[PDB]
Amino acid sequence: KSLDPGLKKGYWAPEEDAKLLQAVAKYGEQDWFKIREEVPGRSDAQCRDRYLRRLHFSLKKGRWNLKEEEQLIELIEKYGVGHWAKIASELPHRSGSQ
DNA sequence: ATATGCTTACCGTAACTTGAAAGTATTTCGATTTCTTGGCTTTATATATCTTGTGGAAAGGACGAAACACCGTGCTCGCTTC
């Protein structure tokens, strides 16, 4: 993921919306090593988290309404603090990064 | 004029995979051991035969002494010369 002349450190999505989203239907959620051979400028390490955080569906998003605080409470009430504790390993997709 | 907060590029460790080197109880080839089978000597009385030693023979070898070959020589025979 570094010192590579073929990688691109860009920020926007030039051609990515196709080059990376084709893997959605082309290949499953495993063996990312196969896709990196066709998409230039993109590495597997960043590709995994990009694919994950861009196409996910079930996430607590929207405006902070009068009913979201109970959601947060029952979230931190599942197993513990969650954000960094080891319980983060079983919280489904609620990693500390977010 | 700037903070809540999302997005996410790049800096970490944990369990699983693919292949090579070292390591573990298996079987077969080949060497080794041990089961045969016959001989190694010891005795006694018995004996006819048959191959081997102790005779003989003698072919196979050189070295020796006298004879013969010619040829010198003076004897014992010849001669010219005075």
Curated annotation (Swiss-Prot):
Annotated coiled-coil segments of the chain: none
Record annotation: effect of changing I87T: In NEDRSO; uncertain significance
Location of this chain's protein in the cell: Nucleus
Domain HTH myb-type, residue spans: 4-59, 60-98
DNA-binding region: 32-55, 84-98
Superkingdom of source: Eukaryota
Disease involvement: Neurodevelopmental disorder with motor regression, progressive spastic paraplegia, and oromotor dysfunction: An autosomal recessive disorder characterized by delayed motor development and developmental regression after the first year of life, followed by progressive spasticity with gait alterations, paraparesis, and oromotor dysfunction. Most individuals have cerebral, cerebellar, or basal ganglia volume loss.
Self-association state and partner proteins as the record states: Part of the SNAPc complex composed of 5 subunits: SNAPC1, SNAPC2, SNAPC3, SNAPC4 and SNAPC5. SNAPC4 interacts with SNAPC1, SNAPC2, SNAPC5, BRF2 and TBP.
Function: Part of the SNAPc complex required for the transcription of both RNA polymerase II and III small-nuclear RNA genes. Binds to the proximal sequence element (PSE), a non-TATA-box basal promoter element common to these 2 types of genes. Recruits TBP and BRF2 to the U6 snRNA TATA box.
Name under which the protein is recorded: snRNA-activating protein complex subunit 4
Organism name: Homo sapiens (Human)
Lineage, top ranks: Eukaryota, Metazoa, Chordata, Craniata, Vertebrata
Included range, full protein: 393 to 490 of 1469
